[PDB]
Design a binder for this molecule. Structure first.
Ligand code: CLA
Ligand code: CLA
Ligand code: CLA
Ligand code: CLA
Ligand code: CLA
Ligand code: CLA
Ligand code: CLA
Ligand SMILES: CCCCCCCCCCCCCCCCCC(=O)OC[C@H](CO[C@@H]1O[C@H](CO)[C@H](O)[C@H](O)[C@H]1O)OC(=O)CCCCCCCCCCCCCCCCC
Ligand SMILES: C/C(C=C=C1C(C)(C)C[C@H](O)C[C@@]1(C)O)=C/C=C/C(C)=C/C=C/C=C(C)/C=C/C=C(/C=C/[C@@]12O[C@]1(C)C[C@@H](O)CC2(C)C)CO
Ligand SMILES: CC(/C=C/C=C(C)/C=C/[C@@]12O[C@]1(C)C[C@@H](O)CC2(C)C)=C\C=C\C=C(C)\C=C\C=C(C)\C=C\[C@@]12O[C@]1(C)C[C@@H](O)CC2(C)C
Lengths: 177, 168
């Protein structure tokens, strides 16, 4: 009856055990929202998209700062400020990436709403397993848990890197030391 | 359910299997409120127009017709051809063809039996049975889509950088 994460709180009604990373940590009861097209399905899809985006962004920042930029690309070690140097010399790359992300996000929203309507697609599912790393069950649950935990950690990390780069105008590991 | 192209999206519910080049790609559901034959005709018309346009752009940046008016790049050829009246002739004959097309598409939508884009233009055969016709329709659709995207890229790159045939 009590949430596993917060023993002083009752179990959130909509979070039983199903989703990976579920420990009952919903103090504000946001999982019970059923308005403005927002429900547990939409919240989970948003959480998974945030997890994946944060993982990609943190990996990119760390890669560029440690191993350096790719040939022909600007340096500076400040990832929040090197973006304007890339846009100053290769605006077409940024524009094409933005257009591609826009199209993919329109497709993602359509897929989310459709899967919410005629329930056949789990939240965050895009059938993207080209290498077959999660075919069999009893490993899919473990992979989902790993992805969720890594994505939450990378969300926090990427938000921290964004704020550090905006404020200190220095590199992430530069702030570290 | 679970359209072939986008495996996580539902089938567009208007494209089951009985159209050439039908991989179930309609995420925004254009076929849900527009006739399928109308959209097919529009797509095939775009394919043919853009194939001709890509070939003409690339060729005219290499070979020029005799005369001083034809000595401009394809990027600047529009303002020269419109002034000389060269594009007026193309406009006149294209308008005639498109009025006949108005009649044809109206008849196709109101029964008839004319397949979308089927003008029966076939001096040579190149398509003897149903299988050959289907294969060549798929080839035409794929080549037309590729040429539409290719002309888009060619024009955008040439406008961005006023370069010759290599528009990099
Ligand atoms: C420009 C084109 C474009 C379009 C049309 C979309 C469309 C969409 N995105 Mg999206 N996105 C884009 C570009 C785009 N994205 C780019 C370039 C990125 C960064 C790589 C993202 C990152 C992103 C994330 C991380 C999420 C979406 C989500 C969504 C969906 C919810 C839209 C909504 O209600 O937001 C309303 C618009 C807002 C700005 C509201 C957000 C306000 C928050 C509180 C800002 C917090 C900032 C703090 C620091 C929708 C399908 C969400 C989703 O799929 O949920 C299911 C989601 O979680 N997008
Ligand atoms: C959220 C994900 C994300 C985003 C938005 C970016 C964004 C960027 N990266 Mg990047 N990167 C990422 C993840 C990401 N990266 C990951 C996961 C890795 C590791 C594989 C890298 C490795 C990487 C390198 C090695 C370099 C960049 C560079 C760049 C910049 C120019 C390239 C470009 O337009 O990207 C779109 C590019 C393609 C689609 C190709 C741009 C600011 C370049 C740069 O200027 O860095 C300073 C560069 O040299 N990235
Ligand atoms: C810690 C990293 C990590 C892990 C463990 C997973 C794990 C998973 N992802 Mg995933 N993903 C990640 C990062 C990760 N992701 C990032 C950064 C992105 C953004 C590019 C995505 C984008 C993504 C999509 C679009 C989809 C998945 C899917 C999946 C599931 C099946 C595929 C699989 O076995 O992947 C195993 C992954 C690894 C072994 C990581 C090796 C490095 C599985 C639970 C699919 C899913 O949910 O199906 C239901 C799916 O459609 N992921
Ligand atoms: C994900 C984990 C994580 C880690 C390891 C760090 C680590 C660090 N952060 Mg940080 N941060 C994080 C998340 C994290 N942050 C998040 C989620 C945010 C909010 C978006 C911030 C916002 C933030 C700011 C605004 C600043 C730091 C600073 C720092 C550095 C000084 C640490 C300290 O105690 O100084 C005290 C240190 C390298 C400081 C720094 O760069 O020092 C020069 C600094 O000014 N962080
Ligand atoms: C979308 C189709 C299209 C359009 C609008 C244009 C437009 C133009 N072309 Mg052009 N061209 C095209 C296709 C096209 N071309 C193709 C496919 C080729 C390859 C043979 C060429 C080869 C070409 C050359 C070599 C030159 C031009 C030039 C020009 C410019 C002025 C003279 C002229 O009209 O061309 C004259 C066109 C030709 C001599 C060949 C056209 C052959 C046609 C397109 C193929 C048969 C299709 C058939 C007749 C369709 C019937 C239509 C129906 C309604 C009845 C003008 C901007 C001239 C210029 O100023 O260059 C900058 C020039 O020197 N074009
Ligand atoms: C790769 C080029 C290509 C291909 C394979 C086709 C294929 C086809 N076209 Mg077609 N077409 C094209 C370009 C192409 N088109 C262009 C650029 C135009 C504009 C002038 C047209 C205008 C056109 C008309 C007006 C008609 C067709 C028709 C046809 C079909 C029977 C004729 C045939 O076998 O064509 C053979 C073509 C080739 C072998 C291409 C090589 C040429 C060098 C077939 C599906 C007919 C149809 O709808 O039948 C069902 C018909 O009435 N086409
Ligand atoms: C049809 C496929 C195709 C191919 C092979 C290329 C190929 C290329 N494009 Mg491109 N492009 C295409 C379609 C294509 N484009 C489309 C449909 C658009 C949108 C209209 C663009 C918009 C575009 C821009 C804006 C730029 C390129 C650039 C480039 C070059 C890098 C390379 C030669 C770049 C380049 O070198 O331009 C000078 C560049 O800046 N492309
Ligand atoms: C930003 C604009 C907000 C848009 C609101 C969309 C839905 C939000 C909503 O209705 O839930 C608002 C959420 C949902 O609140 C939940 O509602 C459920 C019934 O609908 C149950 O009653 C839950 O117990 C209750 O917590 O409540 C809060 O988050 C209030 C927290 C305020 C903290 C201030 C510090
Ligand atoms: C209606 C809609 C879409 C939809 C739909 C459909 C289509 C109807 C389908 C469904 O049926 C429903 C629904 C709702 O899904 C809404 C669209 C979404 C919006 C409104 C898009 C918002 C995106 C904004 C982002 C993601 C911007 C991020 C900015 C960054 C800046 C980066 C910086 O580097 C910059 C530039 C400068 C640097 O110095 C430092 C920083 C600041 C870090 C980080 O990235
Ligand atoms: C949109 C795009 C790029 C957009 C870039 C933009 C907006 C950038 C704009 C800017 O930089 C400028 C210009 C100047 C700056 O000052 C301002 C900004 C704004 C910064 C590229 C698309 C590029 C699109 C591309 C490359 C498409 C390739 C498509 C292929 C290969 C298709 C293949 C098929 O069609 C066939 C062949 C057969 C079919 O049946 C099957 C498939 C597979 C679908």
């Amino acid at each position: 009856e009590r949430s596993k994460s917060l023993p002083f709180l009752m179990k959130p009604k909509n979070l039983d055990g199903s989703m990976a990373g579920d420990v009952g940590f919903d103090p504000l009861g946001l999982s019970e929202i059923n308005d403005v097209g927002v429900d547990l399905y939409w919240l989970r899809e948003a959480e998974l998209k945030h997890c994946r985006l944060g993982m990609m962004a943190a990996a990119g920042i760390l890669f560029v700062e440690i191993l350096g930029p790719a040939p022909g690309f600007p340096a500076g070690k400040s990832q929040m400020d090197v973006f304007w140097k890339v846009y100053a010399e290769k605006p077409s790359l940024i524009g094409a990436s933005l257009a591609a992300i826009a199209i993919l996000e329109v497709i993602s929203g359509v897929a989310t709403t459709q899967g919410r309507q005629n329930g056949d697609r789990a939240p965050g599912d895009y059938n993207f397993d080209p290498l077959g790393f999660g075919k069999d069950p009893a490993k899919f649950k473990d992979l989902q848990l790993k992805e969720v935990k890594n994505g939450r950690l990378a969300m926090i990390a990427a938000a921290g890197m964004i704020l550090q780069g905006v404020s200190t105008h220095q590199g992430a590991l530069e702030n570290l030391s | 359910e679970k359209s072939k192209a986008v495996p996580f999206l539902p089938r567009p519910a208007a494209l089951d299997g009985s159209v050439v080049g039908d991989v179930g790609f309609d995420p925004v559901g254009f076929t849900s409120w527009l006739p399928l034959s109308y959209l097919q005709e529009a797509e095939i018309k775009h394919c043919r127009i853009a194939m001709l346009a890509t070939l003409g752009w690339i060729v005219a940046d290499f070979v020029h017709l005799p005369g001083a008016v034809h000595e401009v790049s394809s990027l600047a050829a529009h303002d020269v051809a419109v002034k000389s009246g060269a594009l007026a002739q193309i406009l006149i004959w294209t308008s005639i063809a498109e009025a006949i097309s108005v009649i044809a598409i109206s008849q196709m939508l109101e029964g008839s039996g004319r397949q979308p884009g089927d003008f029966k233009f076939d001096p040579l055969n190149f398509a003897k049975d149903e299988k050959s016709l289907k294969k060549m329709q798929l080839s035409e659709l794929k080549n037309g889509r590729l040429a539409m995207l290719a002309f888009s890229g060619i024009v955008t790159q040439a406008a961005l950088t006023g370069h010759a045939f290599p528009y990099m």
